[PDB]
Design a protein around this ligand. Structure first.
Ligand SMILES: Cc1cccc(C(=O)NCC2(NC(=O)c3cccc4nocc34)CCCC2)c1
Ligand SMILES: Cc1cccc(C(=O)NCC2(NC(=O)c3cccc4nocc34)CCCC2)c1
Lengths: 242, 242
């Protein structure tokens, strides 16, 4: 083993649909991280924490209306069981539309936790008091309406898994990518990429990355003090663009 | 049948990992939309469009480096097959970090398409010229780094599926939710929700929704001309908060 013990990442998941998480535990990079014991994902289903005959996991809101909520007791007890399995040091995160917006900076923070517990909401969500009593942080992957927190949870897992030691193995938008063939339906590859001049290629790729970031996500540049070369190349691209 | 024919939604998916999409075709609302033939998700794997013995689906970039790309030919041919199955009127979308930021307004646009083709990238992504020749629009679910476009694609599907006629059955942040019990670890439900005065409950919920939106996602209010009642309640919440 090249990777030290205690650097593996453990992620507890609370969800009404545990089998959804096969999408990340059995495929791609995260699937290989699980297979090589670098990442462990353990799911608990609130349905297993009910006591009525029909395993009711939703409840009606105080004040009335069609907006169903997750039943507090089965959800709370699932979280407590996850906390027990995790031991001390587990951060409990609720995937939530009203959470702090997830960005790469936020991902970097969350990835510093060896133990995470992710709570996935269904219906209209969870009781507000559970957030105060059980939840440490709320996070959102975007401003749009979904039907569950499972997909955002898997997104979070996918993003933090890249930080696990032993996996593979800088946040700015990528330069345009080119692979075979040399001419695709009449469209040619930029000659510099065919040139074999790797110092020229390096400068070109960096410049194209800065320009594209500037044009499509200028906000990403607002939290960075760019290097002298990057500032020089960006200024060139800005002048050439206009 | 209560739902008219031709209102069902068809979504073609291009992905190296088709089985991941069981997460949305077999569970929750989207799973029920598929089971009731309101939503159809059809996947094509670029691996089935290779011709070498080992079904190679990645390629090396012009200019060198460790950044692998999707091989153009198998990906392109999968897209063409999806286009053929869809017929005319299918919009091809590439799930991309450099795409237009997905929000609920953007979701509403995409949901106006009866036919969608979603292209999921792996590795460092796809050839730039394929975007020009095959892709209609690029979309991003957020500014953070992932390992694949499948999860964003499933997020998009989940969000647009809510617009399908026959499914269930306003974008602002929700008011705090409360369900049983009345007192949770000492924390009580706001008395108005217990009161049975539904006109008071209506005003309270609306006010709490506006205040929370104002405090956590003030940008969501910037594209709306609020109603007289909403402006009145928001002004009250703002004054009370400060
Ligand atoms: C803008 C807005 C306002 C009001 C409701 C909703 C909404 O989508 N409510 C539905 C639920 N949404 C999410 O969990 C959810 C959704 C989106 C991104 C996310 N990132 O993490 C969890 C996320 C709430 C619990 C069950 C599903 C969205
Ligand atoms: C900010 C930034 C800069 C540079 C690279 C990346 C990055 O994550 N590159 C890796 C890939 N990311 C996505 O596809 C992807 C990622 C995130 C949201 C998305 N919404 O749709 C598709 C999405 C590109 C193709 C294969 C995976 C991200």
């Amino acid at each position: 083993g090249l990777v030290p013990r205690g650097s593996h990442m453990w992620i507890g998941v609370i969800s009404l649909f545990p089998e959804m998480f096969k999408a990340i535990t059995e495929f791609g990079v995260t699937g290989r991280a699980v297979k090589h014991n670098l990442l462990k994902v353990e799911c608990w289903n609130p349905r297993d924490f009910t006591f009525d005959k029909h395993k009711t996991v939703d409840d009606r809101p105080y004040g009335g209306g069609p907006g169903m909520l997750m039943m507090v007791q089965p959800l709370r007890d699932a979280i407590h069981t996850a906390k027990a399995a995790a031991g001390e040091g587990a951060k409990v995160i609720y995937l939530s539309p009203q959470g702090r917006k997830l960005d790469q900076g936020g991902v970097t923070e969350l990835a510093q936790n060896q133990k995470l517990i992710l709570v996935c909401g269904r219906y209209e969500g969870i009781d507000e008091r559970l957030i105060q009593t059980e939840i440490d942080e709320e996070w959102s992957i975007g401003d749009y309406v979904l039907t569950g927190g499972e997909l955002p949870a898997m997104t979070l897992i996918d993003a933090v898994a890249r930080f696990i030691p032993g996996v593979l193995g800088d946040g700015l938008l990528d330069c345009p990518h080119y692979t075979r063939p040399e001419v695709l339906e009449g469209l040619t590859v930029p000659p510099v990429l065919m040139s074999g001049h790797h110092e020229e290629i390096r400068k070109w790729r960096l410049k194209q990355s800065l320009q594209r970031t500037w044009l499509r996500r200028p906000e990403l540049l607002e939290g960075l003090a760019l290097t002298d070369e990057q500032r020089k190349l960006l200024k060139e691209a800005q002048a050439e663009h206009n």
